[PDB]
Structure formats: C-alpha cells, structure tokens
Design a protein around this ligand. Structure first.
Ligand SMILES: OC[C@H]1O[C@H](OC[C@H]2O[C@@H](O[C@H]3[C@H](O)[C@H](O)[C@H](O[C@H]4[C@H](O)[C@H](O)[C@H](O[C@H]5[C@H](O)[C@H](O)[C@H](O)O[C@@H]5CO)O[C@@H]4CO)O[C@@H]3CO[C@H]3O[C@H](CO)[C@H](O)[C@H](O)[C@H]3O)[C@@H](O)[C@@H](O)[C@@H]2O[C@@H]2O[C@H](CO)[C@@H](O)[C@H](O)[C@@H]2O)[C@H](O)[C@@H](O)[C@H]1O
Ligand code: CA
Length: 174
C-alpha cells in the first residue's frame, strides 16, 4: 500500500487555530488560555497550556479539528514538543480519536519516556521532541480528529506544543 498526503496542518498563523477546540480532559487540566497559537515554536505551532498533576498513569488533555477527508484516511502523524526543562520525569502516552463514534486509535503505540528523548531547537530554546504515528482503518462517518496528549506520572504545568499534523490516504485506486 502506497499513501499520499491528504491533509496537513503546520499552524502557519493564528487563523488556523480557530479550527481547533478543547474537547475535554481526564485527570488533568488546561490552563487559561487553554489553546493558543505560538509563532516561535515550529515556525507556528499549537500551544496547549496544561496542568498535569503527575499522580496517575492517564492524565489527558484533548484538542480536536474537523477534517473533511478523515473517513478516507489510514495514517495520522504529528509531533509533540515539550520545553527541555531539566529534571522532568514521567511518560507521554499520546493517541488520537476519530469522531463520531469515539473510535480510539493508536492507544499505547507511541509511548515515550521524557528522560530519554530527542531534542529540537527553536529560537535557541530546546524542546523534547516526540513523533506520533498511528495507523487505522478507513472509518465511515468520521469527521473530527481529536489529539490526546496524555501524561503518565508526568508532573508538568506549562506549555506543550503540537505541530505537523499529517493525514494520509491510499493512492493508486487501491
Ligand atoms: O463513552 C464511550 C466510551 O467511554 C469511555 O471512553 C471514553 C473516555 O476515555 C477516557 O480515556 C480512557 C482512554 O480512552 C483509554 O481507554 C485508557 O485506557 C488505559 C487505562 O486507563 C490504563 O492506563 C491502561 O494501562 C495498561 C496500558 O495501557 C498497557 O496496555 C499496559 O501494557 O498495561 C497497562 C495495565 O494493564 O492502558 C489503557 C490504554 O491502553 O483509559 C482512559 C481513562 O479511562 C477511565 O475513565 C473513562 C471515562 O469515561 C472510563 O470510566 C474508563 O472505563 C476508565 O478506565 C477519557 O478520554 C474520557 O474523556 C473519555 O470520555 C469521553 O469524553 C468525551 C468528552 O466528555 C465525551 O464526548 C464522551 O461521551 C466520553 O465521555 C470508555 O472507556 C469506553 O469504553 C466507552 O464506553
Ligand atoms: Ca509549524
């Protein structure tokens, strides 16, 4: 199977951010503002201001966007950036959901320990970098993608950034 990029969001300006919403939390909170554009990170990125208590293994904040072709797609990728503050501990368990249907995709497929992470630099500041790649079946009726940013005993009050959201569909008529 060969795939082509069907949709991509790189967060070029605040105008893209209006397409994203806060779809809720579980054992975690957003700060205020909850979601905003950031023009330094990723040359434009989605900034989630989070408060993860670090007490349990599933501390989730979620953001969502409508994607017209979602029902045609089978691969999602995106990046997560967290400032490289020293001494952070815990694991990320990021995933996604297709809706309607609350179809959970990628559960525990992209888990990462923050104490051994790749780094990327933006404006001379370092960020831990986590890539998320999720394969799923074409799912009838889905119109919304929810990205779930999940901490597991990751005590953190600060910004987490999403960038480079990519959706792929099969090509060649197959
Ligand atoms: O309403 C339909 C739907 O409702 C519930 O699902 C939706 C809610 O999901 C919550 O998040 C879930 C995750 O989706 C996922 O299921 C996760 O599972 C992990 C589990 O907690 C644990 O950490 C586990 O440890 C494993 C591990 O992962 C490995 O596999 C390892 O090898 O082994 C270890 C140990 O075995 O891993 C699991 C992942 O692989 O759990 C979380 C938290 O779920 C708790 O809370 C739920 C709340 O509804 C429910 O009570 C669940 O039973 C319980 O465990 C959240 O995202 C929550 O927000 C979702 O609710 C939706 O929210 C939106 C906004 O309000 C609404 O629109 C929806 O109506 C709904 O409320 C349920 O799980 C489903 O079965 C289904 O019934
Ligand atoms: Ca970007």
């Amino acid at each position: 199977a060969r795939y082509v990029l069907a949709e991509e969001v790189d967060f070029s300006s605040p105008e893209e951010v209006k397409n994203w919403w806060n779809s809720g939390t579980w054992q975690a909170e957003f700060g205020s503002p909850d979601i905003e554009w950031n023009g330094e990170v990723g040359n434009g990125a989605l900034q989630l201001n989070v408060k993860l208590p670090g007490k349990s293994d599933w501390e989730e904040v979620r953001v969502a966007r409508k994607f017209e072709r979602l029902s045609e797609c089978e691969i999602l990728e995106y990046d997560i950036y967290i400032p490289n503050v020293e001494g952070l501990k815990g694991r990320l368990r990021p995933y996604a959901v297709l809706n309607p249907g609350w179809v959970k995709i990628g559960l525990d497929m992209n888990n990462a320990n923050v104490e051994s992470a790749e780094i990327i630099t933006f404006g001379g500041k370092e960020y831990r970098r986590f890539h998320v790649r999720i394969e799923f079946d074409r799912t009838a009726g889905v119109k919304e993608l929810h990205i779930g940013v999940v901490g597991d005993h990751l005590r953190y009050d600060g910004p987490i950034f999403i960038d480079n959201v990519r959706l792929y569909k099969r090509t060649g008529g197959m």
